[PDB]
Design a protein around this ligand. Sequence first.
Ligand SMILES: [Mg+2]
Ligand SMILES: [Mg+2]
Ligand SMILES: [Mg+2]
Ligand SMILES: [Mg+2]
Ligand SMILES: [Mg+2]
Ligand SMILES: [Mg+2]
Ligand SMILES: [Mg+2]
Ligand SMILES: [Mg+2]
Ligand SMILES: [Mg+2]
Ligand SMILES: [Mg+2]
Ligand SMILES: [Mg+2]
Ligand SMILES: [Mg+2]
Ligand SMILES: [Mg+2]
Ligand SMILES: [Mg+2]
Ligand SMILES: [Mg+2]
Ligand SMILES: [Mg+2]
Ligand SMILES: [Mg+2]
Ligand SMILES: [Mg+2]
Ligand SMILES: [Mg+2]
Ligand SMILES: [Mg+2]
Ligand SMILES: [Zn+2]
Lengths: 206, 60, 24, 92, 127, 118, 98, 84, 155
Amino acid sequence: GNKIHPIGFRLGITRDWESRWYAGKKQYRHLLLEDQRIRGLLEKELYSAGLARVDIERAADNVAVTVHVAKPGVVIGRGGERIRVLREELAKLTGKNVALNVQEVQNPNLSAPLVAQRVAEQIERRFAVRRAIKQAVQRVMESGAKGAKVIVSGRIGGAEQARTEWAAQGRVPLHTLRANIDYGFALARTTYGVLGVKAYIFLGEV
Amino acid sequence: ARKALIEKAKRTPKFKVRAYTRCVRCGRARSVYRFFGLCRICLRELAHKGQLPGVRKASW
Amino acid sequence: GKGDRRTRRGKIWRGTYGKYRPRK
Amino acid sequence: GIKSFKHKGLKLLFEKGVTSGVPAQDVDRINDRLQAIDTATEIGELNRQIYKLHPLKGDREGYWSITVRANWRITFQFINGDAYILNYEDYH
Amino acid sequence: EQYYGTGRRKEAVARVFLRPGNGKVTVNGQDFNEYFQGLVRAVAALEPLRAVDALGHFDAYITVRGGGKSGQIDAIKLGIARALVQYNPDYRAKLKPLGFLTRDARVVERKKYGKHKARRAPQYSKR
Amino acid sequence: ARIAGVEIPRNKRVDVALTYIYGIGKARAKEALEKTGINPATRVKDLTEAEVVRLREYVENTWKLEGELRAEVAANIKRLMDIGCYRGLRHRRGLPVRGQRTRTNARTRKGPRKTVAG
Amino acid sequence: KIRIKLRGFDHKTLDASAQKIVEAARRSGAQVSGPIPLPTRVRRFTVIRGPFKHKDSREHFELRTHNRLVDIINPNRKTIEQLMTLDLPTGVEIEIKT
Amino acid sequence: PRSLKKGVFVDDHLLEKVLELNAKGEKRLIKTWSRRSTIVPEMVGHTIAVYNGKQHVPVYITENMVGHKLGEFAPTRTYRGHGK
Amino acid sequence: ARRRRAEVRQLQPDLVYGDVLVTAFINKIMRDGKKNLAARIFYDACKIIQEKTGQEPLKVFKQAVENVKPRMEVRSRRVGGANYQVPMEVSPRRQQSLALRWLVQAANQRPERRAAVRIAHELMDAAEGKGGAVKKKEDVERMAEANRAYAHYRW
RNA sequence: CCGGGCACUCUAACGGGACUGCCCGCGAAAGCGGGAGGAAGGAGGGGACGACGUCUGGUCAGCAUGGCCCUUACGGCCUGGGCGACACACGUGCUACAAUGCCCACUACAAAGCGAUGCCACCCGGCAACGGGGAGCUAAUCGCAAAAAGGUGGGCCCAGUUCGGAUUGGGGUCUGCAACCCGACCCCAUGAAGCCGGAAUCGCUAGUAAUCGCGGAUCAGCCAUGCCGCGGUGAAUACG
Ligand SMILES: [Mg+2]
Ligand SMILES: [Mg+2]
Ligand SMILES: [Mg+2]
Ligand SMILES: [Mg+2]
Ligand SMILES: [Mg+2]
Ligand SMILES: [Mg+2]
Ligand SMILES: [Mg+2]
Ligand SMILES: [Mg+2]
Ligand SMILES: [Mg+2]
Ligand SMILES: [Mg+2]
Ligand SMILES: [Mg+2]
Ligand SMILES: [Mg+2]
Ligand SMILES: [Mg+2]
Ligand SMILES: [Mg+2]
Ligand SMILES: [Mg+2]
Ligand SMILES: [Mg+2]
Ligand SMILES: [Mg+2]
Ligand SMILES: [Mg+2]
Ligand SMILES: [Mg+2]
Ligand SMILES: [Mg+2]
Ligand SMILES: [Zn+2]
């Protein structure tokens, strides 16, 4: 049980925060619990949209929130009717009065969280783990990326003995503090139990 | 950390000395930092994700 | 020494003030 | 006669019938074993094939070990018609 | 007219101002021998002077803040060493070989976790 | 000079010396000398018969000392000991009274370790 | 004499921010006292790495807060024009007391 | 060297219930979980039964034991003696 | 020291005699890094060597060290079963370390209540060839040369 | 302190600097030795960072989760007790056995932190804890804060002591609905063991060990002699 989170490790560089807003002492804890409330619903809802990140900027009673998706449609809605439901369901949580932008993911095949969830799902549907994994690494590796790697937890195939599956291609330097490796974790509830899924994608460097 | 034992939010301390922090995410009453409302664990989990604004990794 | 609660050090050690380590 | 417990769950199952300290499917199993260790007037009676009895070695010398199920053991010290320090324990 | 040289040691800063004169020293006001009242080491600070037969030829006003009177004694020693160069830059030839123009980089070591004092590791028994 | 109940502190500083009395500590020392106006530094032998009388009288009559004191203290303990007082039971049982741990470290109140088989 | 005090988590989101405030008003008031730094206050959170035991795990987390000042004496309408409503950073938060 | 300050505390469960009995003289028993309360004169003569945390022990309150606090007369643990 | 041959830390000369050997001795007196009290004691002592002795302290000191340096010492060693004490020379380096250490030790073994004195008197006695310091030294050599049979295990 | 002034210290942001780059020696090369310059070197000093895997390692008691079990209860509320028991055994520590010391007084150098009912200036009542009053601070501009070891002067005079503070009696402050069980603090009295520790055993290679005080998190208060961190003074030794 070693190695740090590849993101948290690189936060100073090659990776910005998910919530970039000043605050302090009396507020910070309140102004943060909120962010979690926010993210809470978005992930509980926008699942089929393909969640990947939830930036949350601030300045004062005019929050940001910039959900990133693979299928920006599912988010918005018909003509923009859903972005009405949510955007409203939002203030019924934070009187704060906040926006709700939506950026599209340029190739969900380079989004560790996505590749992860991608695999997490297949596994839930009962696909061959090792296959799903190799495939995933291929997709990711086959559409850009200077390196990728996926890891599935254990009880592969519902086996009584928890195992751990691999798969990796090209440089994926977890040690190099400047790599720019996207990390993504996906759960996977199952008849037999939870099985975590980890996706690592390497892009450029400097 | 049983729903039942999260009566901490009940205010009604009858006397304010019966009040107690509790994690605002897991209920981990054990190690809860004030500045975050989070316990030593969650604080570490979130710091790794970047969801803790301007909370980088220390070193010196 | 650091342990005598009624001496300079005993007070300093226990981080306190009293007839033996007045405020000034 | 059983005279002392080291395992609380074991203690409660035999004394009050409290089953919430042991596995639910091993309730009947553990019970018949404990009654056998209670009725035993000598270690020779705790010798049925289904118990896989044997004294432990090393620092656990003076102790005995009948098998409940799988890798689970009830260990104790038998002396003068009585067992002491009844423990429900994992061999590792 | 005047000469300068800073000087830092183990977290101490000393403003050294030499000035052609008697050879006295005003450290933070008090006399050299007054600030360092009873410290067998003090004598050190002025060693860079005797280095090139100064002292009884110069004079020094010195501001010192930070650390401890021991660290200050070395900062001041470096100050008097630097300043003594802005004056005559030719002093290096003899002032350096002694190492007076170096900045002792030895500082306190961070206190690492798991250990009692950065290194002093806790002890065990029948391990 | 002999002062309180069979008290004979001699050849040392008067303060120090008065300390040798049951109810006198380094505190009452500087005071009894303070009030009675006597140098504390004077060697008990070098004292004056006049000073030894003001001391002998000021001290003996101002504080409850020696035997009479041990009598009180003993009397106290006996009391909280006669009434079901827990604190009193701690005296009977011979265990620490001021709520300390008795699983380890109580030798000052228990005596020498009384090792048993284990 | 409008004293501005800028605080932020990013030492760039300020040097950028507080620097705009300098170039702007430098054409409608005095000449600004330049963005003076000011000590940073760091918050350390030393936490045990894993749950249950392992007392000596740890790993350090700090939340350093940075400050900036500036100071514009000789306030002149247009100053409060080039500044008043032309900021940009989000990871910043000001407090001003003229 | 005990100490409360200014306001000798006594729960008024038994207080206003003990003095009410002072009107008809005394009574025959009491029983409070308030071992937290100090003892005041009005309690003297009476017989309050305190809680072990398991039992209600009869404690005859005499003068000699006023200032104390009921619980000091109702032992919790048992001990009885070690071995052997 | 598996790799290098750990070089000796070079000490800054005395702030009075500019003699390094002195600093060394002062460092052996020091305890808890209270190097001032340590320096004092050795100087107060040097002035006690001036009074009670018409000689220059510095020379009394060096003379002392000299008589207290063992030239042969015994070092244990396992050789076929038993642990024979092999006798052998003493490095110039080790001679000093031992001499100074022994002085301070024997010095703090003396009776006189004053630290500075014990050092003063110990040094002198050492110069004359007497004192607890020189005892150990002569005891060491005696130890060797008394085990000079196993000296063919030269080492 | 005042005007004034950014030089200096510093504050924090950026830029430079080290690469065996230059000189001599050996080498096929990598590089080893030596020397100059330089604040610094041959990885300049300390962190973050822990590979494929190992131990059926640790935690379902943080959280998550398969299966099993309980549902007037194996759930839930409350008051009180317990987690603080002791004949004993061990681990990690604190304080100490003293004169390179202890006590009183006077006087001097630090860093990193924290502060809204919060830090608490200063003044008063109290021996004191602390209480009353009340300024500033929203905190490089006010407070915690006194750094301690240290320097100077005095006392102690080798004694279980002006060492050492356990234990116990009494008085009292403070937080808190409430301090019997079971808080910390103050003052008086008490003043224990301990005179340097058997077999055995632990740490650390320099600003390290050793020693001295300072801050923080948790937190009403606090059992902190713990933990994380700060700076002061500052060694010995390494043949092998
Ligand atoms: Mg739960
Ligand atoms: Mg609480
Ligand atoms: Mg004392
Ligand atoms: Mg067998
Ligand atoms: Mg240190
Ligand atoms: Mg380790
Ligand atoms: Mg530890
Ligand atoms: Mg480690
Ligand atoms: Mg009623
Ligand atoms: Mg070359
Ligand atoms: Mg590396
Ligand atoms: Mg296991
Ligand atoms: Mg416990
Ligand atoms: Mg143990
Ligand atoms: Mg110690
Ligand atoms: Mg007063
Ligand atoms: Mg003196
Ligand atoms: Mg010793
Ligand atoms: Mg606290
Ligand atoms: Mg502390
Ligand atoms: Zn939590």
